Amino acid sequence: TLDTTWKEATLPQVKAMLQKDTGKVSGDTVTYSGKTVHVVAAAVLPGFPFPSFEVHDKKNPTLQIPAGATVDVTFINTNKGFGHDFDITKKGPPYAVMPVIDPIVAGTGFSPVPKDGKFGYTNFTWHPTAGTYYYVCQIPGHAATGMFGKIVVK
Ligand SMILES: [Cu+2]
């Protein structure tokens, strides 16, 4: 039930997609509003620390999403040498080297490692129920060393 469908994007296409995130930054939180919201996350953008996810040009920010919203997530793997995944779970940190995060409520399989000047990305839709969730990478050791962020659906 994980999303294992990866589309190819060049760097300009990646940038264009990153700019489509509909959240507003305050502090270290990205707040979304409206009936449908579009989260665009990337794994380790240039200039950002490994390992981390970036959303709206912030490092592992907390995503604030309205209860009742349909969440369209775009996940892009911009990180050379790694096939990061993006999985949403109720299980919080700290994470084991091999995270035990079932059930995964929405998310992806492992992404392709970047190649041919191209990056893998994917889109999935999530209809969350109010609560605190986390977006996590399951590549061994990544979540244990900080590759995760929080989602507050309220
Ligand atoms: Cu990772």
Does 127 count as an annotated binding residue? no
- The structural domains of the chain, with segments of one domain joined by +, span 1-154
Q: Quick one: CA dihedral 145, 110, 134, 69, positive or negative? A: positive
Ligand 1 centroid, distance to 110 Cα (angstroms): 9
Q: Are 36 and 70 in contact (CB under 8 A)?
A: yes
Is 84 known as a binding-site position? Answer: yes
Which method was it determined by?
X-ray
Neighbouring residues of 79: CB distance < 8 A, sequence distance ≥ 6: 43, 44, 50, 114
Residue 147 assigned ligand-binding role: yes
Report domain 1-154's class.
mainly beta
Q: Is the dihedral of CA 49, 42, 119, 122 positive or negative?
A: positive
Overall residue count recorded for the chain in this entry: 154
SS3 content of the chain, % helix, strand, coil (to 5): 5, 40, 50
| Cα 83 to ligand 1 centre (Å) | 7
Distance CA 45, CA 60 (A): 11
Q: Which of 108, 119, 107 lies closest to 9, judged by CA?
A: 119
